[PDB]
Amino acid sequence: SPVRVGLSVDASALGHTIPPDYTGLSYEQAQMANPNYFSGANTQLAGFLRTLGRQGVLRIGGNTSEYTFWNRHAKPTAADEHLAAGPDKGHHAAAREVITPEAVNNLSEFLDKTGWKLIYGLNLGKGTPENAADEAAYVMETIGADRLLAFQLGNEPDLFYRNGIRPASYDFAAYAGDWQRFFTAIRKRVPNAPFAGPDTAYNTKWLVPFADKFKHDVKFISSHYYAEGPPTDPSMTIERLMKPNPRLLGETAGLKQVEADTGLPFRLTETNSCYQGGKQGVSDTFAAALWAGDLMYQQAAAGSTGINFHGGGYGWYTPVAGTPEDGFIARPEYYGMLLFAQAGAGQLLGAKLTDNSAAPLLTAYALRGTDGRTRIALFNKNLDADVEVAISGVASPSGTVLRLEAPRADDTTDVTFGGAPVGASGSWSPLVQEYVPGQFVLHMRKASGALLEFA
Numbered sequence: 001s002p003v004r005v006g007l008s009v010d011a012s013a014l015g016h017t018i019p020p021d022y023t024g025l026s027y028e029q030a031q032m033a034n035p036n037y038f039s040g041a042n043t044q045l046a047g048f049l050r051t052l053g054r055q056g057v058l059r060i061g062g063n064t065s066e067y068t069f070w071n072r073h074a075k076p077t078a079a080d081e082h083l084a085a086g087p088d089k090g091h092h093a094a095a096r097e098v099i100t101p102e103a104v105n106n107l108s109e110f111l112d113k114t115g116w117k118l119i120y121g122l123n124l125g126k127g128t129p130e131n132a133a134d135e136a137a138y139v140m141e142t143i144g145a146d147r148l149l150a151f152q153l154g155n156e157p158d159l160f161y162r163n164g165i166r167p168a169s170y171d172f173a174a175y176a177g178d179w180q181r182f183f184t185a186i187r188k189r190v191p192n193a194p195f196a197g198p199d200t201a202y203n204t205k206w207l208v209p210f211a212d213k214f215k216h217d218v219k220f221i222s223s224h225y226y227a228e229g230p231p232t233d234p235s236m237t238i239e240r241l242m243k244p245n246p247r248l249l250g251e252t253a254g255l256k257q258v259e260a261d262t263g264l265p266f267r268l269t270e271t272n273s274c275y276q277g278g279k280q281g282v283s284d285t286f287a288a289a290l291w292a293g294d295l296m297y298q299q300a301a302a303g304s305t306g307i308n309f310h311g312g313g314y315g316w317y318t319p320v321a322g323t324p325e326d327g328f329i330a331r332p333e334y335y336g337m338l339l340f341a342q343a344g345a346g347q348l349l350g351a352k353l354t355d356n357s358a359a360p361l362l363t364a365y366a367l368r369g370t371d372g373r374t375r376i377a378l379f380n381k382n383l384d385a386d387v388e389v390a391i392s393g394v395a396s397p398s399g400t401v402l403r404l405e406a407p408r409a410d411d412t413t414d415v416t417f418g419g420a421p422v423g424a425s426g427s428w429s430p431l432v433q434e435y436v437p438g439q440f441v442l443h444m445r446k447a448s449g450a451l452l453e454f455a
Contacts, residue, residue, distance in 0.1 A: 002386040002443060003359035009366045009376065009393035013350025016303045018367070020345045021117060022296070023337060024057035024308035025049070025319060026270045029121050030064035030085035031312055032107065033097040035076050036324045037083075040109030044328040047425030048320045049114045052334075052341050058111070059119040059269050059308040061155045061199070063088035066125025066165055067096055070135035074100045084323045086313025087277040093164060101138065108142050117149045119196065119222070119269060119308070122186075124154035124178055125165040129185035137189045150196035150219055152269075153182045158200045172209050183217060196222040199269060202251035208258065215262040220305060222269040223255055227291065228279070236274050238287040238409050242361050242381035248295075252302045259303070267306045268299055272333075278316025286332045286406035286415050288317065290449055293336030293404070294379040297365040301348050309333065330422040332406070332415045338428065339404050339417060339451050343367060343375045351376065359385045362444075376452040380444040383409055391440040396454035399436040404449030 031037050037045075038058075049056065064085060080098075088094055111118060120139055122132040136151055157175045160166040166174070179197070186193050195218045198210040202223055211221055227245055228236045255266040273283045273291055282288070296307055311318030319337060322328035330338075344367075351366035361381035368374055374394055380387055402418035415421070419432025436442055436452055444450055 002388040003356070004388045004390065005356040005359055005362065006354040007364055007389050007391045008352045008354070009374070009391065010350030010352070011368065011374070011393070015301050015348030017347045018300045018345045019305060021053070021055040021057055022300060022306045022345065023053035023341060024059060024306055026059040026062065026308040026310040027312045028062040028064040028085040028088055029060050029068045029099070030083070030094060030097045032060060032068065032099045032103045033076070033080045033085070034083040035100065035103040035106045036081060038103070038110040039106035040113055042110060042324055043113070044322070044425045045320065046110060046113040047427070048328060048330060048334070049116055049426070051422065051426035051428055052337050054115055056116045057119060057149060057306055057308060058116045061119070061121025061152050062270065062310065063090055063155060064094045064097070065121035065123055065155045067094035068099055068123060069096065069127065070099050070131055070138070072101060072134060072138065074098050076100050076102055082325065084313045087310055087315040087317065089277045090163065091276070099135070104138055104142050111143065111147050117147050118143055119150050119152060120148065121152045121155055122182065124157070124182055125160060129182050132182050133185040133189040136186045136193055140190045140193065145192055148194065150194045151186070152196055152199050152222060153179050154197070155199050156224065157198060158203065158206045172206050175206070176213060179214065194219045196220050196267070196269070198222070200224060202254040211258045211262045211264055215264055218264060221255060221258055221264045221266040223251070223266055224270040225251060225268055226272060226275045228274040236279055236282050238282055238285065239383065241273060241282060241287055241291050242383060252299065256303060265305045267308070268304055269308045270310050271295070271307060272310045272317040274317065280316055281410060283317035284331060284412050285409065286411045286447070287409045288333040289336035289404060289415060290379050290381050290447070291336070292333050293339045293377065293449060294363050294381065296337065296340045297363070297377055301365065309337065327424070330426070332412065334422065335404060335415045335417050336449070338422065339377060339449060342402065343377055343451055344369050344371070346370050359387045362387055374454045378442070378444060378450045378452070380446060380448045383447050386446050387444050389442045389444065391442065392438060394440060394454055395438050399440060399452050399454040400433050401436050401442065402430050402433055402451045404451070409447040
């Protein structure tokens with residue numbers, strides 16, 4: 001029998017307004033070595049991004065940003081034109097790659113087809129300040145100041161020690177000296193260059209001193225989050241993935257404190273479920289759709305300006321998989337982001353769950369859409385409990401529901417939203433949309449999601 005829970009919506013309990021460019025993706029900078037990938041000719045991938053949002057942000061960076069080198073002198077090679085760069089596993093040095101004027105030009109045409117803005121990684125790990133200034137100048141010339149949200153100087157600098165890029169003694173003081181040298185060089189070439197950083201998780205040895213020192217020099221704080229904790233934690237499981245993560249709550253509170261102290265907003269510029277490219281049987285499963293969609297809302301309710309799910313190639317956690325030659329497909333995590341896209345932007349409202357101790361992993365978020373209509377997003381992350389949700393405080397005459405479904409939490413396929421899979425090039429329309437029975441009652445199966453929209 002289902003667990004009977006109450007949901008009280010309070011249209012006077014205003015939360016944050018979700019911006020229109022909240023959604024986003026993150027890719028490896030190595031992928032720019034292939035000028036066919038982020039290109040105006042890549043209509044398939046452009047289509048998947050448009051489905052995720054009419055506005056959004058493409059972040060290019062990652063571990064490979066330290067191994068990728070701008071050369072204004074270079075043309076793409078034959079092997080460059082077929083390169084597929086999945087998420088870097090971090091075990092060893094990436095291969096050296098080269099980015100060319102042609103790739104940057106094609107990236108501009110890609111962004112023209114999507115409507116998305118760009119965060120672009122520069123090579124602080126192994127590059128020079130002069131070459132970063134030259135790359136920044138070319139990006140600003142080609143992409144333009146309207147679409148270029150920020151440059152990033154270094155990816156995960158707090159892991160440079162441990163990973164070969166700097167010695168074990170590298171600390172914030174050393175990184176600040178590096179950051180200032182790059183910033184100064186770039187701004188001489190590009191006086192309007194925007195920056196974000198420090199591209200780490202919230203922590204005290206790096207991110208708090210960064211914001212204090214560089215607040216007048218950055219547009220916003222860029223933070224990373226992975227659900228998987230330290231390497232010495234028990235192996236990530238779907239069960240663990242569905243539970244609240246105290247570290248996420250604490251890291252988010254820290255970023256909110258920084259915003260209060262410095263005036264700087266924050267964006268989660270690289271996230272996914274499990275690091276080192278993801279974990280087979282967790283990251284590539286329908287559980288990841290529930291995890292992601294819930295995370296999008298949890299961060300929005302905390303005042304995050306946006307998110308960027310890491311991906312590329314055929315990585316276990318990528319939202320979109322594929323290549324220009326073979327075509328692209330939506331993986332299960334995409335469907336959680338699709339629920340958010342279908343819900344749209346607007347202002348968050350109070351939504352309090354009660355009588356839920358037997359179904360403790362159910363989450364719910366209420367939103368007043370830009371168009372005035374109330375939506376509720378529910379993620380029944382309980383793996384063994386169906387629920388029956390008695391909804392009060394919504395005074396609309398009727399509502400409809402689109403279900404986020406798969407037959408098992410560990411399914412790697414068979415994922416649908418609104419009774420339909422996503423097709424080629426991001427094509428999606430709901431095919432099954434049922435009416436919801438100031439007192440609404442919604443049933444949800446275990447390990448499922450729903451988007452309600454009221455008239």
